[PDB]
């Protein structure tokens, strides 16, 4: 069970490790986006796509991790350990959760095919060194 | 954002508030059962039933948390915070992950409706004093 | 070569990893039951169901191992190695042979699907703390 | 329950005790043969013939006996007992398991009828003393 | 024989001397992208295109070379020679492996004709002196 | 990417490693044969068959390894490391490249099915003992 979360969505995780951290914007932005755009889809008792379901589970998990951060904030005495822990959290689990959220929400809004083709073109782009790399990378949209 | 992860299956988090904490099992056994019964359906490219997807994401989350715990165990100095964090994980977040995993596993194998009937029958069983309560609470099979 | 002997029946060795060791019964009683219920179908020339074939080969293997144990008991000098080997057989290899025999016997008599349901229901029963667990775990019959 | 493992395959064990040990080659050769030729049949969750099923069970049993040998190798102090035990193993259980494996795999590759007729002719052959016995015994093939 | 490997696909090594070295990105990025895209089709027991087959052979070649690198790292004593071997490998032979990977992967995604047109357009781009050279080097897209 | 390159042609490294290593000829004679027969087809602009393509890429890999060999021979100072590296190459990677080249060449000349049958028959020949084995090993041909 080395399970790939994207295998049922056509892609893999090695695909997405090509592109950097900074392209993934803040967790709070993605959560607010998801809420504002698809609260009707999330809260309703009908699953339109498995993207929505994994999105629900990821949002719940991230809420639990925020509870973890708060609990460690309100109980531990050593500032070093607390800072190190929250740094690890908001860096690495931030990376992974932002990745997952971006993929699911992008595939919903713009379509699975378009996202896969975008990631193909981006993997071709960023894998080019600066000399022959264009300065303004591809951007995402439907048509 | 105020989501109940069970809203899409007819169930509700309040419905599991019937069940106590101690009832749900250790995590290692759950993961072992899940793998040994559904390895091929998990790793394969198919969302044959969305319970599979929830199980995928839950297992990945628990792996992420185990990586967190190991990272903390092999980097920090004060063992107080270390053991405290490990305890907090394995108790409190273990509760949520156990809830979610148990539910989705039971729904995969035995069926959603039968699981709902199991939960409500257990709530009837436990909303009852000890004496007239039979000592063999319901456990499920087909 | 990495074979699971249960792969051909929808089951999996990981699925039996739910069950503990002590649960499965002594070997002599299993062999007695097997013979007394299926002597004619075993010795007869017919592979009416492949569980019969697995049972044949398993009984022959256990007879081979009992012959091994007797051969060691009536040829060696140091009783340490003697009793050690006998213990190792009757515990560790007994585990595998008991697993295999119990499964194939239950599948012969009661049915493959019902046995799978039995295993998963037992896993639900045991992935549960002691208190809310009923003290009458499922046992099977028709 | 003096069960014959071959009664459901047309033959018996007294049939095969006519022919010698040496005709059965090494266990490792047979296992590697079985793997190389029919890993797709073994590992798949579909039983094509009861030969395959008994083959699975025999391979698992032999793996367990190898585990037995290793365990005795790693725990006992008396070299005499260890050597005697492993000798018994690789001689006698070697004989039986090689017999079983050869029969099943041969019947699969070449057919049950051909194997039974081969064993008939061989029992007629080796049961002849050297004077009137041919020097180059029968060999196995389809056509 | 000095086979021109790109000869089946209308392309040349002369066509690749248009491109500089730095244009090709790091090998780990290539492998990660290739995995996350087409891991299933690679491990799939089917030859979808000769591109796939050459890609499989090249991945195995790189695996052999990295295994060699690890062996030499874990057994050799003369350190300057060791480091020089490692750098020589991962630069000089990594270059050609990157050429191979990039070509076949881009041909899989976007098509052979498109890659050829890309290469000749890039040649027109770089063979222009830097003054009147436009600032945007072309890249690829399904847009 | 647990890749086995022979999957495109109905075989595996395990099916191929069923033979010993000594059977596999030296790489030099293989390149001699392959060149002196199919140089015109392999340098051609034509994907005549995937066997040719795997052969092309494999020959590139081996030529590049020989380039490495010459670089090492003409640029290191410590001859011990030179010997270790070079003989390690021609043993370990020599084995794999020999296997690959022989497979694809045999498939070109005689045909895929025939080479598979030859592997099977030769292995069953060589592992079976000589007395009851056929007197001569089979040798593949149309």
Numbering used by the authors:
A (entry chain B), D (entry chain B), E (entry chain D): 1 to 143
B (entry chain A), C (entry chain A), F (entry chain C): 1 to 142
Paper text:
The T = 3 and T = 4 capsids were reconstructed to essentially the same final resolution– 3.5 and 3.6 Å, respectively, and atomic models built into the resulting density maps. The CB interface involved ca. 25% less area, 18% lower free energy, and 42% less burial of V124. In the T = 4 capsid, several residues were identified as hot spots with high confidence. In particular, F23 and F122 were identified with high confidence in all four interfaces, and when these residues were mutated to Alanine and the proteins expressed in E. coli, capsid expression was either largely (F122A) or completely (F23A) inhibited. In contrast, R127, which when mutated to Alanine enhances the solubility of capsid dimers, was identified with high confidence in the AA, BD, and DC interfaces but it was not identified as important at the CB interface. In T = 4 capsids there are two forms of trimer-of-dimers, Types I and II. As Type I has the lower potential energy, this form should persist and nucleate T = 4 capsid assembly for protracted periods.
The virion is composed of a structurally distinctive capsid (called core-antigen) containing the genome and polymerase, and surrounded by a lipid envelope with embedded surface-antigen protein. The assembly domain is also unusual in that it polymerizes according to two different geometries i.e. T = 3 and T = 4 icosahedral quasi-symmetry.
